[PDB]
Design an enzyme around this catalytic site. Structure first.
Site, short mmCIF file in Angstrom:
data_model
loop_
_atom_site.label_atom_id
_atom_site.label_comp_id
_atom_site.label_asym_id
_atom_site.label_seq_id
_atom_site.Cartn_x
_atom_site.Cartn_y
_atom_site.Cartn_z
N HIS A 40 33.82 -4.90 -30.99
CA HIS A 40 34.34 -4.76 -32.37
C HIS A 40 35.83 -4.39 -32.41
CE1 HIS A 40 33.39 -0.34 -32.18
NE2 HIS A 40 34.46 -0.28 -32.97
N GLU A 52 48.78 7.55 -21.46
CA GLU A 52 49.14 8.14 -22.76
C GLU A 52 48.57 9.54 -22.94
OE1 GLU A 52 51.28 7.38 -24.91
OE2 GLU A 52 51.44 5.24 -25.33
N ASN A 54 50.43 11.91 -25.99
CA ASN A 54 50.86 11.73 -27.37
C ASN A 54 51.20 10.25 -27.60
OD1 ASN A 54 52.32 11.62 -29.86
ND2 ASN A 54 52.58 13.86 -29.71
N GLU A 62 53.63 6.78 -19.14
CA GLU A 62 53.08 5.55 -19.73
C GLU A 62 53.27 4.31 -18.86
OE1 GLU A 62 55.33 7.50 -21.34
OE2 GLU A 62 54.33 8.29 -23.13
N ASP A 84 27.85 -4.58 -27.85
CA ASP A 84 29.22 -4.24 -28.33
C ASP A 84 30.13 -3.89 -27.14
OD1 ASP A 84 31.42 -3.71 -29.92
OD2 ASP A 84 30.67 -1.80 -30.71
N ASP A 171 31.33 14.97 -32.81
CA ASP A 171 31.05 13.53 -32.72
C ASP A 171 32.34 12.77 -32.38
OD1 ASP A 171 29.57 11.11 -32.91
OD2 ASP A 171 29.30 11.25 -35.08
N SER A 172 32.19 11.51 -31.95
CA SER A 172 33.31 10.56 -32.01
C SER A 172 33.44 10.06 -33.46
CB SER A 172 33.13 9.40 -31.01
OG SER A 172 31.90 8.72 -31.20
N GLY A 175 38.54 5.14 -34.93
CA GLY A 175 39.73 5.26 -34.08
C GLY A 175 39.40 5.61 -32.63
N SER A 177 36.72 4.17 -31.33
CA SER A 177 36.07 2.89 -31.01
C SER A 177 36.56 2.31 -29.72
CB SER A 177 36.38 1.86 -32.10
OG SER A 177 35.72 2.20 -33.29
N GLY A 178 35.62 1.89 -28.88
CA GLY A 178 35.94 1.24 -27.60
C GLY A 178 36.24 2.18 -26.44
C1 LIG Z 1 38.22 2.26 -38.25
N1 LIG Z 1 37.19 1.22 -38.20
C2 LIG Z 1 37.59 -0.13 -37.77
C3 LIG Z 1 36.58 -0.64 -36.75
C4 LIG Z 1 35.18 -0.59 -37.35
C5 LIG Z 1 34.81 0.86 -37.69
O1 LIG Z 1 34.69 1.61 -36.48
N2 LIG Z 1 33.92 2.73 -36.50
C6 LIG Z 1 33.67 3.27 -35.39
C7 LIG Z 1 32.85 4.48 -35.27
C8 LIG Z 1 32.32 5.12 -36.39
C9 LIG Z 1 31.53 6.26 -36.25
C10 LIG Z 1 31.28 6.76 -34.97
C11 LIG Z 1 30.45 7.99 -34.76
N3 LIG Z 1 30.00 8.63 -35.75
N4 LIG Z 1 30.18 8.39 -33.51
C12 LIG Z 1 31.81 6.11 -33.85
C13 LIG Z 1 32.59 4.96 -34.00
C14 LIG Z 1 35.82 1.53 -38.63
CA LIG Z 2 53.13 8.64 -25.16
#
Ligand SMILES: CN1CCC[C@@H](O/N=C/c2ccc(C(=N)N)cc2)C1
Ligand SMILES: [Ca+2]
Length: 223
Positions: A40, A52, A54, A62, A84, A171-172, A175, A177-178
Protein backbone atom coordinates in the site's frame (compact mmCIF):
# COMPACT_ATOMS: atom_id res chain seq x y z
CA UNK A 1 3.98 5.46 16.66
CA UNK A 2 1.58 6.23 19.54
CA UNK A 3 2.66 5.65 23.16
CA UNK A 4 6.25 4.77 22.24
CA UNK A 5 9.65 6.29 22.91
CA UNK A 6 12.41 8.11 21.05
CA UNK A 7 14.55 5.28 19.56
CA UNK A 8 17.81 7.22 19.56
CA UNK A 9 19.73 8.22 16.40
CA UNK A 10 20.70 5.24 14.18
CA UNK A 11 19.77 2.65 16.82
CA UNK A 12 17.45 1.02 14.26
CA UNK A 13 19.92 0.74 11.37
CA UNK A 14 17.62 -1.19 8.98
CA UNK A 15 14.86 1.45 9.23
CA UNK A 16 14.38 3.39 6.00
CA UNK A 17 12.21 6.36 5.09
CA UNK A 18 10.55 6.31 1.65
CA UNK A 19 10.56 9.83 0.22
CA UNK A 20 8.69 11.32 -2.75
CA UNK A 21 9.37 14.96 -1.81
CA UNK A 22 8.36 14.14 1.79
CA UNK A 23 8.42 11.06 4.03
CA UNK A 24 5.40 8.87 3.19
CA UNK A 25 6.26 5.33 4.40
CA UNK A 26 8.78 3.23 6.26
CA UNK A 27 10.65 0.19 5.00
CA UNK A 28 13.30 -2.31 6.07
CA UNK A 29 16.69 -2.78 4.41
CA UNK A 30 17.22 -6.51 3.81
CA UNK A 31 20.47 -6.35 1.85
CA UNK A 32 22.68 -3.69 0.24
CA UNK A 33 20.29 -3.32 -2.75
CA UNK A 34 16.77 -4.19 -1.51
CA UNK A 35 14.11 -2.81 0.79
CA UNK A 36 10.89 -4.51 1.98
CA UNK A 37 7.85 -2.27 2.52
CA UNK A 38 4.03 -2.53 2.29
CA UNK A 39 2.34 -2.81 -1.09
CA UNK A 40 0.00 0.00 0.00
CA UNK A 41 3.14 2.20 -0.02
CA UNK A 42 3.56 1.66 -3.78
CA UNK A 43 4.13 4.80 -5.88
CA UNK A 44 6.52 5.93 -8.61
CA UNK A 45 9.52 8.24 -7.98
CA UNK A 46 10.61 6.74 -4.66
CA UNK A 47 13.87 7.85 -3.10
CA UNK A 48 15.04 5.58 -0.28
CA UNK A 49 16.56 7.40 2.72
CA UNK A 50 18.87 5.34 4.90
CA UNK A 51 20.69 6.33 8.07
CA UNK A 52 17.88 8.75 9.04
CA UNK A 53 17.03 10.01 12.49
CA UNK A 54 15.55 13.49 12.09
CA UNK A 55 13.92 13.28 8.63
CA UNK A 56 13.86 17.10 8.37
CA UNK A 57 17.57 17.67 9.17
CA UNK A 58 20.73 16.42 7.44
CA UNK A 59 22.65 15.03 10.41
CA UNK A 60 25.60 13.22 8.78
CA UNK A 61 24.81 9.51 8.42
CA UNK A 62 22.22 9.60 5.60
CA UNK A 63 22.38 7.78 2.31
CA UNK A 64 19.80 8.90 -0.26
CA UNK A 65 19.42 6.36 -3.09
CA UNK A 66 16.71 6.41 -5.79
CA UNK A 67 14.69 3.25 -6.39
CA UNK A 68 15.32 1.56 -9.75
CA UNK A 69 12.27 -0.71 -9.51
CA UNK A 70 9.38 -1.69 -7.29
CA UNK A 71 7.74 -5.11 -7.16
CA UNK A 72 4.33 -5.34 -5.52
CA UNK A 73 3.41 -8.88 -4.42
CA UNK A 74 1.68 -10.72 -7.31
CA UNK A 75 -1.41 -11.38 -5.12
CA UNK A 76 -1.73 -8.03 -3.37
CA UNK A 77 -5.37 -7.00 -2.91
CA UNK A 78 -5.72 -3.31 -2.05
CA UNK A 79 -9.32 -3.74 -0.76
CA UNK A 80 -8.56 -6.46 1.83
CA UNK A 81 -4.84 -5.65 2.18
CA UNK A 82 -4.09 -9.36 1.80
CA UNK A 83 -0.46 -9.87 0.76
CA UNK A 84 0.49 -6.28 1.76
CA UNK A 85 4.17 -6.50 0.79
CA UNK A 86 6.44 -4.88 -1.79
CA UNK A 87 10.12 -5.06 -2.73
CA UNK A 88 12.08 -1.98 -3.77
CA UNK A 89 15.48 -2.22 -5.49
CA UNK A 90 18.02 0.60 -5.03
CA UNK A 91 19.76 2.16 -8.06
CA UNK A 92 23.10 1.63 -6.28
CA UNK A 93 24.15 -0.53 -3.33
CA UNK A 94 23.96 1.08 0.12
CA UNK A 95 27.24 1.31 2.05
CA UNK A 96 26.73 -0.94 5.09
CA UNK A 97 28.27 0.05 8.49
CA UNK A 98 26.94 0.08 12.11
CA UNK A 99 24.39 2.83 11.47
CA UNK A 100 23.13 1.46 8.13
CA UNK A 101 22.63 -2.28 8.23
CA UNK A 102 20.38 -4.96 6.83
CA UNK A 103 17.91 -6.96 8.94
CA UNK A 104 17.69 -10.77 8.67
CA UNK A 105 14.65 -12.49 7.16
CA UNK A 106 13.01 -15.07 9.43
CA UNK A 107 13.64 -18.80 8.97
CA UNK A 108 10.43 -19.59 10.87
CA UNK A 109 7.32 -17.69 11.91
CA UNK A 110 7.14 -16.04 15.34
CA UNK A 111 4.65 -17.02 18.03
CA UNK A 112 2.00 -15.11 19.97
CA UNK A 113 3.69 -13.57 23.01
CA UNK A 114 7.00 -12.85 21.26
CA UNK A 115 8.18 -9.31 22.00
CA UNK A 116 9.03 -7.22 18.94
CA UNK A 117 10.28 -3.73 18.13
CA UNK A 118 8.06 -1.60 15.90
CA UNK A 119 9.42 1.71 14.59
CA UNK A 120 8.66 4.69 12.36
CA UNK A 121 7.99 8.39 11.80
CA UNK A 122 4.18 8.10 11.81
CA UNK A 123 1.53 9.98 13.81
CA UNK A 124 2.12 10.00 17.60
CA UNK A 125 -1.46 10.87 18.57
CA UNK A 126 -4.42 8.50 18.93
CA UNK A 127 -6.91 11.33 18.43
CA UNK A 128 -5.20 14.34 16.87
CA UNK A 129 -2.25 14.58 14.51
CA UNK A 130 1.39 15.19 15.39
CA UNK A 131 4.25 13.92 13.25
CA UNK A 132 7.63 13.50 14.91
CA UNK A 133 10.82 14.43 13.22
CA UNK A 134 12.93 11.73 14.93
CA UNK A 135 12.40 7.97 14.79
CA UNK A 136 9.98 6.53 17.35
CA UNK A 137 9.98 3.00 18.75
CA UNK A 138 7.48 0.68 20.44
CA UNK A 139 8.11 -2.66 22.13
CA UNK A 140 4.99 -4.81 21.64
CA UNK A 141 3.95 -8.47 21.83
CA UNK A 142 2.53 -10.52 19.00
CA UNK A 143 -1.11 -11.34 19.82
CA UNK A 144 -2.82 -14.70 19.38
CA UNK A 145 -4.51 -15.28 16.08
CA UNK A 146 -7.81 -15.90 17.93
CA UNK A 147 -7.72 -12.51 19.67
CA UNK A 148 -6.65 -10.87 16.38
CA UNK A 149 -9.62 -12.43 14.55
CA UNK A 150 -11.98 -11.48 17.42
CA UNK A 151 -10.82 -7.84 17.23
CA UNK A 152 -11.32 -7.71 13.47
CA UNK A 153 -14.08 -10.17 12.46
CA UNK A 154 -13.91 -11.33 8.82
CA UNK A 155 -10.71 -9.38 8.04
CA UNK A 156 -7.68 -11.32 9.28
CA UNK A 157 -6.08 -13.64 6.73
CA UNK A 158 -3.30 -16.22 7.17
CA UNK A 159 -0.89 -13.52 5.90
CA UNK A 160 -1.61 -11.14 8.78
CA UNK A 161 -0.97 -10.97 12.50
CA UNK A 162 -1.87 -8.57 15.29
CA UNK A 163 0.62 -7.03 17.67
CA UNK A 164 0.21 -4.49 20.42
CA UNK A 165 -2.09 -3.88 23.35
CA UNK A 166 -5.83 -4.60 23.48
CA UNK A 167 -6.17 -1.91 26.19
CA UNK A 168 -5.11 0.71 23.61
CA UNK A 169 -2.71 3.65 24.00
CA UNK A 170 0.29 1.98 22.30
CA UNK A 171 0.30 1.25 18.54
CA UNK A 172 1.75 2.03 15.13
CA UNK A 173 -0.19 4.63 13.10
CA UNK A 174 -0.54 6.53 9.79
CA UNK A 175 2.96 7.25 8.43
CA UNK A 176 4.46 4.11 10.01
CA UNK A 177 3.10 2.11 7.03
CA UNK A 178 5.59 -0.28 5.47
CA UNK A 179 7.97 -0.08 8.46
CA UNK A 180 9.47 -2.99 10.45
CA UNK A 181 8.28 -5.31 13.16
CA UNK A 182 11.51 -7.01 14.32
CA UNK A 183 11.49 -9.90 16.81
CA UNK A 184 14.75 -11.36 18.15
CA UNK A 185 16.70 -9.81 15.24
CA UNK A 186 14.35 -11.07 12.49
CA UNK A 187 11.95 -9.10 10.30
CA UNK A 188 8.61 -10.76 11.20
CA UNK A 189 6.14 -8.02 10.27
CA UNK A 190 5.41 -4.97 8.16
CA UNK A 191 3.16 -2.12 9.38
CA UNK A 192 -0.02 -2.72 7.35
CA UNK A 193 -3.32 -1.49 8.86
CA UNK A 194 -5.62 -0.88 11.86
CA UNK A 195 -8.77 0.81 12.88
CA UNK A 196 -7.62 4.32 13.86
CA UNK A 197 -4.51 4.07 16.10
CA UNK A 198 -4.03 2.91 19.68
CA UNK A 199 -7.79 2.32 20.02
CA UNK A 200 -9.14 -0.10 22.63
CA UNK A 201 -9.58 -3.63 21.19
CA UNK A 202 -8.14 -2.50 17.85
CA UNK A 203 -4.47 -3.56 17.81
CA UNK A 204 -2.11 -3.07 14.85
CA UNK A 205 -2.31 -5.50 11.96
CA UNK A 206 0.93 -6.57 10.32
CA UNK A 207 1.97 -8.40 7.15
CA UNK A 208 3.24 -11.89 8.14
CA UNK A 209 6.72 -11.77 6.58
CA UNK A 210 7.67 -15.42 7.24
CA UNK A 211 5.06 -16.42 4.60
CA UNK A 212 6.93 -14.42 1.95
CA UNK A 213 10.57 -15.43 2.48
CA UNK A 214 10.55 -17.83 -0.51
CA UNK A 215 9.06 -15.14 -2.76
CA UNK A 216 11.49 -12.49 -1.48
CA UNK A 217 14.56 -14.69 -2.03
CA UNK A 218 13.58 -15.85 -5.50
CA UNK A 219 12.57 -12.32 -6.54
CA UNK A 220 15.91 -10.90 -5.38
CA UNK A 221 17.73 -13.77 -7.14
CA UNK A 222 16.31 -12.79 -10.58
CA UNK A 223 16.05 -8.99 -10.38
C1 LIG B 1 -1.69 7.87 5.85
N1 LIG B 1 -2.37 6.82 5.09
C2 LIG B 1 -1.97 6.62 3.69
C3 LIG B 1 -1.77 5.13 3.44
C4 LIG B 1 -3.04 4.38 3.82
C5 LIG B 1 -3.33 4.56 5.31
O1 LIG B 1 -2.32 3.93 6.08
N2 LIG B 1 -2.61 3.55 7.35
C6 LIG B 1 -1.77 2.82 7.94
C7 LIG B 1 -1.98 2.34 9.31
C8 LIG B 1 -3.11 2.69 10.05
C9 LIG B 1 -3.28 2.21 11.35
C10 LIG B 1 -2.30 1.38 11.90
C11 LIG B 1 -2.44 0.84 13.30
N3 LIG B 1 -3.42 1.19 14.02
N4 LIG B 1 -1.52 -0.01 13.76
C12 LIG B 1 -1.18 1.02 11.15
C13 LIG B 1 -1.02 1.50 9.85
C14 LIG B 1 -3.44 6.04 5.72
CA1 LIG C 1 18.22 13.39 8.56
Amino acid sequence: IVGGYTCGANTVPYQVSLNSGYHFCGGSLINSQWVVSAAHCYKSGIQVRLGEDNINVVEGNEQFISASKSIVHPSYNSNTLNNDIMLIKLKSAASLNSRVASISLPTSCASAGTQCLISGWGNTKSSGTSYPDVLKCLKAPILSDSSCKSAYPGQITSNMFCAGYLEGGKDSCQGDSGGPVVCSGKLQGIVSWGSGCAQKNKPGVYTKVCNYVSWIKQTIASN
